[PDB]
Design a protein around this nucleic acid. Sequence first.
DNA 1: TTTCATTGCAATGAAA
DNA 2: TTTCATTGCAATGAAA
Lengths: 255, 255
Amino acid sequence: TWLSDFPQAWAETGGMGLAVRQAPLIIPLKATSTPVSIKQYPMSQEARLGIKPHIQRLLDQGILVPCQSPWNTPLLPVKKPGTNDYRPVQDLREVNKRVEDIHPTVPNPYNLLSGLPPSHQWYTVLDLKDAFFCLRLHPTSQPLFAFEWRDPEMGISGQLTWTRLPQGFKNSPTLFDEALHRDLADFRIQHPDLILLQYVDDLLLAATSELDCQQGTRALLQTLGNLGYRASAKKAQICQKQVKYLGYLLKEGQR
Amino acid sequence: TWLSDFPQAWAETGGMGLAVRQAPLIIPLKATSTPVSIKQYPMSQEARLGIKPHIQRLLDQGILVPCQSPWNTPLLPVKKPGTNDYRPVQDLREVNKRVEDIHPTVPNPYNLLSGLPPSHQWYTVLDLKDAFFCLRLHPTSQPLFAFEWRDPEMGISGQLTWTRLPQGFKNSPTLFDEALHRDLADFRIQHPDLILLQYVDDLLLAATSELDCQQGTRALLQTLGNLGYRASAKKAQICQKQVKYLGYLLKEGQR
DNA sequence: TTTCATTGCAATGAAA
DNA sequence: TTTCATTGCAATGAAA
């Protein structure tokens, strides 16, 4: 299908992404910040067991690495919405308070959609998978996001940290949005006729005709794969005249 | 003393007042009002006994009279501040809500005092006793303020009401202030040099010299007695250069 | 687990 | 006794 034509663009077949054109990110601290070390809260075995496979997988992917850092924040066991599956959720609030603020450049959905003309009725919606993880973290900034991990069988001494932009970090959405904007700048230039809306990891491609939407989508997927990002094939809405984007149902230029 | 020179002006020796020049007051109801009859709440014997002498005294003074009225509000036993003496307090709130509003013409103490020049350093302060009771209530408006009274030994069938402006009636302060202003208009004309401040029942006479304050005070007392009002001799502050008025301590034109 | 904020209302005070 | 309003905080929800 569209899946076979772009094996590298889909998370299903391209493997975990890595934005190769983006320099590892350095995270500036506020002028007065010093490391904060919050001890990990005791976790039930059920919670630890539920979370273990995820840490192992991230460790195998190299997204997490062992470390020793004066910084440390709590790992919280959080059951998926109503479900009984545990998911690791780092409380990075004390770290966020010590990181220098940046201007929020992500447009709110409402204003973003205003840039959608009635002429472009053919849409493609793509969701980038593990977007933040595609952006490398500079070695100097990695220690900042450390947390403790007590092994299952055996493995880690104590602390682990991220080598990619983390979930829970106040500036992750904005930094991802800006980096993807830089990586897709050229694409916008090569396709003056297409309408591309970016909302962090949620992308919408607007075209005038089914052919343009198809040709445009091929190029976009091709480009995304080459840059190192990965779109979810499962969720992909390709060349439809009716799509769901950012909580809206688009059709007939309405909404 | 000053007491003997004006027997009729002092509450101590002039008997209960009655503003003879003021026509009995008619109290206009709002366009949609109908009588409200709130049943009297059961009262302990202690409360009833504590309050009894006051009703009897008001009945003897003719300030209260028997009646039958479609209106009725509760009589509350209220102990004097921390003391164990009971005092009758009528809850006229439902009546107040049905009476047509009037413009509040009583000045707040702050603005009132601003009309006190530094030239007049000699002050006399008089407190009118049972001020509201000095103003008659027109027979047509009396029924409005009725309440129930269960006798001690014997006496009253059920309801009693006021023949004078009542405590607890939202418009009593303003109506008294305006009536006294009308009754003292002439006095202000005959004494252009004196400063007279009126705050409901609290009066302040300001003069330039001790003689003027003494002569002025004589005239004021004389006039008040003839009009039917009564000042408290016990509280009277006559021709002092330092007096307490409306919570302030006046001296050297300060405050 | 903590933190931060929205909500709701019990508790206490004033007054007629 | 009732009513009206100021205060305070317990309860519940969101989030990292």
